Design a protein around this ligand. Structure first.
Ligand SMILES: [Zn+2]
Ligand SMILES: [Zn+2]
Ligand SMILES: [Zn+2]
Ligand SMILES: [Zn+2]
Ligand SMILES: [Zn+2]
Lengths: 213, 211
């Protein structure tokens, strides 16, 4: 299915282009259920901690966002005691062009820059807004408590094929070439583009779909 | 210049996969003046002959067609005694996405299938339509008179024909970052210099830039 192909694609890109700190992959034979790992961002009060997350891909991913939750306790205004995450990318601001990699980076950014005006734990948002120093101390204490313990020419042809693909491939499936363009200047393949009403890159509504030949 | 880059690119591509029926290249150091040779196709009464042509590239090639003419006399309804060729590919159906190789192949095709539609030599066209056997005899006689003087990893080079689908068809150098409503596209530099699509020829209604 489109969802399963896209999940395999993201897995291969994560393996050939690993993130330095984060990590994510299938737990067993179920490609639609992943485990992820995030290291506490170095300039944050979570530095030194390792946080696990569960990911669940819907059957019609990536047109629908994945379900992401923490399983490691963490002291944060936008993450509750069940590990739910309040992150726009995961609900309203989901785009079919985003990947698990980007989602993990956005979670690390959320850990660095909380949104206390949309809390999941009001008392933590209140501390963050009133006493940043105390918020940092407590977030560190919680981190310590729960989150610790003949070839040159082939390599030139491949680099050329790869940098042409990066600029011309559909951003939703990463599989076919963009043969359908919207008036906003962005495009997809026909297959992914017929399943959307707004552009996956700038989110403007699709006024018109012009097919390429 | 754009014309000179495109001429060198076409010359290199004529080197990596030369056309079997034709041959063409600079006469000396003049890149804008070539000599060409086409062999009389076995499909026509010109079979056995070798015909010479001159090629003239305008300074703003390929947005204007090259001027191609025979220097070898030939008996044909669409080629007159000055060596001029009546072939829409050279004027009305010219596209800047076309190359000298396509043109020479179209000229060999014209030698195979003359057009008595609006010919350049009415009397020869009349003979062609009236006494094809006599047309063939005279064409053969004129031919006789004037015209007889690794791969295991190269899958990638094959895969790289993806360039054909993504590169500008005018310059063959940049990528297609501008789209017309007909569905075809060019780079912005080539596209802004055209009023018709280089692939399907519909008038360019609108140019949409890609990102
Ligand atoms: Zn697609
Ligand atoms: Zn857009
Ligand atoms: Zn000249
Ligand atoms: Zn171009
Ligand atoms: Zn067109």
């Amino acid at each position: 299915s489109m969802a399963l192909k896209r999940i395999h694609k993201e897995l291969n890109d994560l393996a050939r282009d690993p993130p330095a700190q984060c990590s994510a992959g299938p737990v067993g034979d179920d490609m639609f259920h992943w485990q992820a790992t995030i290291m506490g961002p170095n300039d944050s009060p979570y530095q030194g901690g390792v946080f696990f997350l569960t990911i669940h891909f819907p059957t019609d991913y990536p047109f629908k966002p994945p379900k992401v939750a923490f399983t490691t306790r963490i002291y944060h205004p936008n993450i509750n005691s069940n590990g739910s995450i309040c992150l726009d990318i995961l609900r309203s601001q989901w785009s079919p062009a985003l990947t698990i990699s980007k989602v993990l980076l956005s979670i690390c950014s959320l850990l660095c820059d909380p949104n206390p005006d949309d809390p999941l734990v009001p008392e933590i948002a209140r501390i963050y807004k009133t006493d940043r120093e105390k918020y940092n101390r407590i977030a560190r204490e919680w981190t310590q408590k729960y989150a610790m313990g003949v070839n040159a020419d082939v390599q030139k042809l491949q680099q050329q094929l790869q940098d042409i693909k990066e600029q011309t491939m559909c951003p939703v499936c990463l599989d076919r070439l963009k043969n359908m363009i919207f008036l906003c200047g962005h495009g997809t393949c026909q297959l992914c583009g017929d399943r959307m009403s707004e552009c996956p890159i700038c989110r403007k509504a699709i006024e018109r779909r012009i097919l390429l030949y």
